[PDB]
Write a protein that binds this ligand. Structure first.
Ligand code: RET
Length: 137
């Protein structure tokens, strides 16, 4: 497939519950959920190599990886982790994360290109899954 594009969020579910599992207190949880309303994802994909830029109104960060090659990024609540992406199917990838320091919930994410031109991203902490849906700008 080709994940490349400028993606704008249209739907986000269970994000507060994910942040709660991660220990974020309620006021900052509500503020974070609001910020996810302007969540934008820019993807450049060349074969198995991905460049991903995640941005909100006031913050931007870049994730760079090749499928099957360990890299370092951060968890959803900002702790540094070692990550490894693999394909699950033609159009879906899954990333497993390992904390560099300390303990914490088991975290992962996925990206999927649907047949209807949507990008579905999920973020997981233990039993709670946040699902977010994007369309091309
Ligand atoms: C492939 C896509 C990835 C790894 C995206 C990761 C996105 C995040 C860790 C987003 C985090 C956010 C917050 C911590 C609060 C504000 C809203 C978000 C969703 C941008």
């Amino acid at each position: 497939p080709n994940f490349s594009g400028n993606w704008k969020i249209i739907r986000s579910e269970n994000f507060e519950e994910l942040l709660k599992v991660l220990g974020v207190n309620v006021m900052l949880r509500k503020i974070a959920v609001a910020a996810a309303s302007k969540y934008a994802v820019e993807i450049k994909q060349e074969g198995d190599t991905f460049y991903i830029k995640v941005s909100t109104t006031v913050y931007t960060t870049e994730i760079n990886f090749k499928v099957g090659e360990e890299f370092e990024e951060q968890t959803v609540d900002g702790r540094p982790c070692k990550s490894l992406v693999k394909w699950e199917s033609e159009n879906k990838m899954v990333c497993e994360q390992k904390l560099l320091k300390g303990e914490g919930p088991k975290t992962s994410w996925t990206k999927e290109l649907t047949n209807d031109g949507e990008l579905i991203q999920t973020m997981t902490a233990d039993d709670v899954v946040c699902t977010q849906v994007f369309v091309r700008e």
